Amino acid sequence: RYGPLRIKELAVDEELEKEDGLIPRQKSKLCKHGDRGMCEYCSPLPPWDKEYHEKNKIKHISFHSYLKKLNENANKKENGSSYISPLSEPDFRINKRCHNGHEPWPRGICSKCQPSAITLQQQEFRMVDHVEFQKSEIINEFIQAWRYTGMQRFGYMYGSYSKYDNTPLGIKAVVEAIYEPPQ
């Protein structure tokens, strides 16, 4: 579509996308240059800098920051491409119709539509960062259920998403109420 896709999504995504999240840094004692002009240590720290996260005891990188990293890694402006979508959800299902000359999978397969070996690896970006319970009663009642009956429970938790200042471009899901399905 000659550029980024056009669709409307949650407000949190929009507001996060508007920000850039750069973490400013001041003149390091190792710099060799006048006041103006930043060399290599005084430059702003990108929001996806793994060193900062692992130094602050954060195990994952606040997905939107990962999106910023991917966009920066490629997609030069004004030239070099006509836009390639940076995010793609992996799919492992065998293509039912490839037909370089072979028939469908049940009785024929080529090397172009063969699911390649899958390399499992721990993900590095977590979509939602902080799950927040508005009040202690919301879960206290749920646990009181087990207390009274002794059996386990299970229930969906409705709520809404919002920013999370404590993490670079982080999101928090605030849960408002819990509904218990018939189980």
Binding site: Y2, K76, S81
Partner: protein, 716 residues
């Protein structure tokens, strides 16, 4: 019919077009009708039709903004068609131009757009421009987005979103893509080849279905760096209107391991998914270099992925792949077979007309002074590619700035507009820039065109007729050869004393049949022998094939023909198709030293002697070298020609050069003492006093003996 003439509209409305009554009747149009108008570069717009009898029949009037949007000039032809299925714009998002809005306070929307769209019903399409004149100010805007897409009518209820950051104007100009064919000159042949090879498969696919063939897919352009390959690809892509998907080489090769393959796969997948499309793989040699180069696995996986993608696209998809490389041998050989980049195109340095066209194209924004002689610059610039000409213009402008720097205060950050007006490049500036130019195209063999007729070669009529019957007849009358079943001769070998003008004969032969000329001097052959050159004989003959009908020329072949290089040359000569109009012309001074294998039939068999110029020939040469020099009125060179018996053309050039040197010395001495616009006969006598033959009697006798031996070898 609908090819209405463009004219300047009286009204300032951005969506109003006035048409003649007669044309309105012809096209059945009416006042207030919204019509789709197409001009140039596939640009389209929506204009409200208004009857206007003032214009001549077959003419229409549009304002400045509409013409700028359509990328057309006054006096052109535009096609107008009905647009009855245009819906009202549900929501239009528009942003202004920053520079225009500078110095404006308050809500711009209410000031300008609110009266502009209310009770107006102005059609708007994405990529258009509209200018609002409010109070004492005039501000331009852009049709950033329209809903429904891509265009719609802005009704009274239509919602307008003016919120957004200002748009810099520099982007539109400095990013001047969509360059048409008018931005490329001096390479009409290759441009026509690429057009006939790309447009027809994409613009008119039904042709090949009617003929029932599979059109060629791959294309590979190559030539010296800086000859506008990328510019030609961009122009073709923009004119064709296809989904261009430029891919760079260094950009792809700079990604982490395991990412370049993903980028290539994604690019090809998107190109396929939006057929028709045109993929341009710039600097492909940086992705798939020759096998003997880097053997690293990361350097092999990319090549394998590219080959797999190239082989996998054979289908009913309209995908054309264009690649650019400095030389044909740099790319892996596997990329030059059927189903891949099997079609080749060669770009060569332009001729005088090409350089003139390039100069005019670049020198249209310069504030040039009156004393401009672009033809003179084109004549005096030989071997310059387009990039060199652009650099020349930049350096000339810089020289002009330096010269005018005296009236500039560097410390002050503001410069008087009067001084800026006085700026103007001059011929002296261009001459200085040429003096500072550093051409580099000629460092390697490159295809070029020559324009020598049968007038710069004096005498030698029998040789001229022999060459004509050997070369010209096959090219122009191959049907006769087919009728008589005779295979045309490939090449000839010129032998004789140095300075006879063999290169001139080769250039003339090339010119007569209108064939591109390739030169390979002795030093190039030696460099190939030592293996320290950037090109090889196989590459030379591949370029010759690509740029057919070509004429390959070898100079002082005896240096290498005293062997691996000779073996390669023989193999290539045997390989070439006979029907191909490729002629190998060798020049040497010691024919007996040539390897006998070169002289065998089916190779450089024909042996042609080039004698020294005769009296009339010497006179003609002297006159030719002095055509553009001021001579003494009443001066005759017949005596000088008579006195110069046994001298070669180089000797006559030396005599003329010494005479000119004496003339310039005398003129400079007179000027310093301060006259002599021409050269008097005394200068010629002084120059002749130092004449010295470049050929000894023994060598001439040896050449005559060899000629007599050759005649006897064919005399029974």
């Amino acid at each position: 019919d609908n090819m209405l003439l463009v004219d300047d509209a009286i009204n300032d409305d951005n969506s109003v077009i006035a048409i003649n009554s007669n044309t309105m009747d012809k096209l059945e149009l009416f006042r207030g009708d919204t019509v789709l108008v197409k001009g140039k570069k596939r640009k389209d717009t929506v204009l409200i039709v208004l009857i206007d009898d003032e214009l001549e029949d077959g003419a229409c009037r549009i304002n400045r903004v509409v013409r700028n949007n359509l990328r057309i000039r006054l006096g052109d032809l535009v096609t107008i068609h009905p647009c009855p299925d245009i819906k009202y714009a549900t929501r239009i998002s528009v942003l202004p131009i920053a520079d225009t809005i500078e110095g404006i306070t308050g809500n711009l929307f209410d000031v300008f757009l609110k009266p502009y769209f209310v009770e107006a019903y102005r059609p708007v399409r994405k990529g258009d421009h509209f200018v609002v004149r409010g109070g004492m100010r005039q501000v331009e805007f852009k049709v950033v987005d329209v809903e429904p897409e891509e265009y719609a009518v802005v009704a009274q209820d239509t919602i307008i979103h003016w919120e957004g950051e200002p748009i810099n104007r520099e982007d539109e100009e400095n990013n001047m893509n969509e360059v048409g064919y008018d931005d490329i000159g001096g390479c009409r042949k290759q441009m026509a080849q690429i057009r006939e090879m790309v447009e027809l498969p994409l613009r008119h696919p039904q042709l090949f279905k009617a003929i029932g063939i599979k059109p060629p897919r791959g294309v590979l352009m190559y030539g010296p760096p800086g000859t506008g390959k990328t510019l030609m690809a961009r122009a073709v892509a923009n004119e064709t209107g296809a989904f261009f998907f430029l891919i760079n080489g260094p950009e792809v090769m700079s990604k982490m391991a395991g990412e370049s393959e993903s980028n290539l796969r994604k690019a090809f997948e998107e190109a396929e998914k939006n057929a028709p499309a045109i993929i341009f793989i710039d600097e492909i040699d940086s992705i798939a270099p020759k096998r003997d180069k880097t053997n690293g696995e990361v350097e092999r996986r990319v090549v394998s992925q590219l080959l797999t993608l190239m082989d996998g696209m054979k289908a009913r998809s309209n995908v054309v792949v264009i690649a650019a490389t400095n030389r044909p041998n740099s790319i892996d050989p596997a990329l030059r077979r059927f189903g891949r980049f099997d079609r080749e195109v060669d770009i060569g340095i332009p001729d005088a007309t090409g350089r003139l066209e390039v100069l005019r194209i670049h020198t249209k924004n310069m504030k040039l002074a009156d004393d401009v002689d672009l033809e003179a610059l084109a004549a005096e610039t030989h071997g310059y590619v387009g990039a060199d000409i652009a650099s020349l213009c930049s350096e000339a402008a810089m020289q002009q700035i330096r010269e005018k720097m005296d009236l500039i205060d560097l410390d002050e950050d503001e410069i008087d507009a009067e001084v800026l007006d006085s700026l103007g490049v001059t011929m002296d500036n261009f001459r200085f820039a040429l003096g500072n130019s550093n051409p580099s195209a000629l460092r390697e063999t490159v295809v070029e065109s020559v324009n020598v007729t049968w007038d710069d070669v004096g005498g030698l009529d029998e040789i001229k007729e022999e060459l004509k019957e050997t070369v010209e007849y096959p090219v122009l009358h191959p049907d006769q050869y087919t009728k008589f079943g005779l295979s045309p001769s490939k090449g000839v070998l010129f032998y004789g004393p140095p300075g006879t003008g063999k290169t001139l004969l080769a250039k003339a032969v090339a010119t007569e049949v209108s064939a591109n000329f390739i030169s390979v001097k002795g030093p190039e052959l030696l460099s190939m022998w030592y293996g320290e050159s950037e090109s090889n004989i196989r590459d030379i003959f591949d370029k010759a094939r690509a740029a057919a009908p070509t004429v390959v020329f070898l100079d002082e072949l005896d240096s290498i023909a005293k062997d691996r290089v000779v073996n390669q040359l023989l193999t290539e000569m045997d390989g070439m198709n006979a029907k191909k109009n490729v002629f190998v012309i060798g020049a040497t001074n010691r024919p007996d030293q040539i390897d006998p294998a070169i002289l065998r039939p089916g190779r450089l068999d024909q042996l042609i002697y080039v004698p020294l110029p005769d009296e009339n020939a010497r006179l003609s040469i002297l006159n030719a070298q002095l055509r553009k020099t001021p001579l003494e009125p009443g001066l005759e060179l017949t005596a000088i020609a008579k006195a110069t018996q046994g001298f070669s053309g180089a000797d006559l050039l030396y005599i003329v050069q010494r005479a000119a040197k004496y003339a310039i010395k005398d003129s400079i001495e007179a000027h310093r003492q301060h006259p002599v616009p021409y050269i008097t006969k005394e200068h010629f006598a002084e120059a002749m006093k130092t004449a010295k033959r470049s050929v000894s009697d023994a060598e001439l006798r040896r050449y005559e003996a060899y000629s007599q031996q050759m005649k006897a070898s064919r005399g029974q």
